[PDB]
Amino acid sequence: GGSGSSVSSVPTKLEVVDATPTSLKISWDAYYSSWQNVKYYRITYGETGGDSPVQEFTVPGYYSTATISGLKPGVDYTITVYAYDTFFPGYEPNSPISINYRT
Amino acid sequence: LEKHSWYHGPVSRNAAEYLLSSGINGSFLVRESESSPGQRSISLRYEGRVYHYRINTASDGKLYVSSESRFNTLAELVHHHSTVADGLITTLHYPAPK
Numbered sequence: 001g002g003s004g005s006s007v008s009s010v011p012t013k014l015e016v017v018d019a020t021p022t023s024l025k026i027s028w029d030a031y032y033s034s035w036q037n038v039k040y041y042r043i044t045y046g047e048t049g050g051d052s053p054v055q056e057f058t059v060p061g062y063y064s065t066a067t068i069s070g071l072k073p074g075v076d077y078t079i080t081v082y083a084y085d086t087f088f089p090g091y092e093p094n095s096p097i098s099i100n101y102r103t
Numbered sequence: 104l105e106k107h108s109w110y111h112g113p114v115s116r117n118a119a120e121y122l123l124s125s126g127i128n129g130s131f132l133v134r135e136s137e138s139s140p141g142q143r144s145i146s147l148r149y150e151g152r153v154y155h156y157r158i159n160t161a162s163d164g165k166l167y168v169s170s171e172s173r174f175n176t177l178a179e180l181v182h183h184h185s186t187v188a189d190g191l192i193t194t195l196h197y198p199a200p201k
Contacts, residue, residue: 039185040108040198058108060197062127087109087182087195 021073048076109198119146129196
């Protein structure tokens with residue numbers, strides 16, 4: 001770590017509020033609650049460090065959670081939430097938030 | 104393309120109304136007409152009603168819902184009417200889920 005002092009894993013600002021073997025429900029209620037006038041979220045997810053397909057969908061800016069389904073049980077996925085406060089063509093936000101997790 | 108969060112492809116008026124059924128003020132989608140292929144419409148929720156607007160194409164190929172405000176692309180039109188209602192019942196705020 002260094003230099004006599006501590007090292008931590010980076011924490012996630014996402015919460016997993018529901019889990020079954022093939023699905024996870026994530027909440028960003030405690031983060032994009034502060035960053036505001038969100039129009040929609042784009043959620044992406046794929047097997048962590050996999051060759052696997054990265055799937056995506058969008059939900060309205062007033063949602064606080066989304067379900068990710070069709071997962072492999074017990075396999076680690078990386079889930080990333082992008083908040084969009086504008087529809088301006090070609091805009092991408094500065095700081096998406098993510099989590100690594102398995103059912 | 105249907106890459107955009109607000110674009111839902113061919114959806115009838117009636118199906119559009121049910122899609123907005125659980126939305127709030129400013130919920131909307133852009134769809135293709137089932138009865139007039141090639142034509143596009145905006146469906147927008149406001150105060151317990153759904154407002155349907157035909158998107159027009161002028162002869163220079165620009166798109167508009169209000170004559171004063173014409174754009175090169177659907178994305179520019181949506182961005183514009185998300186900023187200012189400009190003839191719509193309200194601003195485009197939340198795209199119906201996708």
